[PDB]
């Protein structure tokens, strides 16, 4: 992976994620929403396995976005967990958790779950 | 399990669940919300393993509630998945998924996830 991960990825709803994978396991970049805009850009940070297994297994990885930038504060954070699979049609398959900040009476319904696939195309 | 499951269970938020576990794996009963009321009662149905392992392993089980009765329709359904552990302080430990009916534009945020523990006390 490593060099295979570095680049631009797109998901099925129109979001774009740009990432550098550093030599000792660091992921750093930006996430931007549909429309695409100077103001839908948010910082991302995560970690990946820098020595994956040599059989046809995927590379495990994860990252976080807090939904606050200079134009907007949505009082929430999303984590994606998944694996990179390389080759002709490389993709990242993930499941995600989105938690909102709540009062204690509302805490039982604070978290949504879903899934995304990212491609280079 | 079986006879060990049959009865009244309570969770940490004040909800009450009454269940019969039938000889060949069926679970049937009612769920009622906090307050406790003739009008917060909903039908439940599920399945459990009727021949569990003889070591100290739990009994795996699951059930569903659709949130519609004669007084109220909330256009949603919850599934609980977990295991029964018996003995002096028996409990059922679960994780759950709540899906609302949505338009396709809203489908990415249709499902919440959380967790409950039920006791006989």
């Amino acid at each position: 992976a490593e060099a295979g991960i570095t680049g631009t990825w797109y998901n099925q709803l129109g979001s774009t994620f740009i990432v550098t994978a550093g030599a000792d396991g660091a992921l750093t970049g930006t996430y931007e929403s549909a429309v695409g805009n100077a103001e839908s850009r948010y910082v991302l940070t995560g970690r990946y396995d820098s020595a994956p297994a040599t059989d046809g297994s995927g590379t495990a990885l994860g990252w976080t976005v807090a939904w606050k930038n200079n134009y907007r504060n949505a009082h929430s954070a999303t984590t994606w967990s998944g694996q990179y699979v390389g080759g002709a049609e490389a993709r990242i398959n993930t499941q995600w958790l989105l938690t909102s900040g709540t009062t204690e009476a509302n805490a039982w319904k604070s978290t949504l779950v879903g899934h995304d696939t990212f491609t280079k195309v | 399990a079986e006879a060990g499951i049959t009865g009244t269970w309570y969770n940490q938020l004040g909800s009450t669940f009454i269940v019969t576990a039938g000889a060949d794996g069926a679970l049937t009963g009612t769920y009622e919300s906090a307050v406790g009321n003739a009008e917060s009662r909903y039908v439940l149905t599920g399945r459990y393993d009727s021949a569990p392992a003889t070591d100290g392993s739990g009994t795996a089980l699951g059930w569903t509630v659709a949130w519609k009765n004669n007084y109220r329709n909330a256009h949603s359904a919850t599934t609980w998945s977990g295991q029964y552990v018996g003995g002096a302080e028996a409990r059922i430990n679960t994780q759950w998924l709540l899906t609302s009916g949505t338009t396709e534009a809203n489908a990415w945020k249709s499902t919440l996830v959380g967790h409950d523990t039920f006791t006989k006390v």
Binding site: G14, S33 | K109
Partner: peptide
């Protein structure tokens, strides 16, 4: 309209 969703 949460920023994770489409659009905005």
């Amino acid at each position: 309209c949460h920023p994770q969703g489409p659009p905005c």
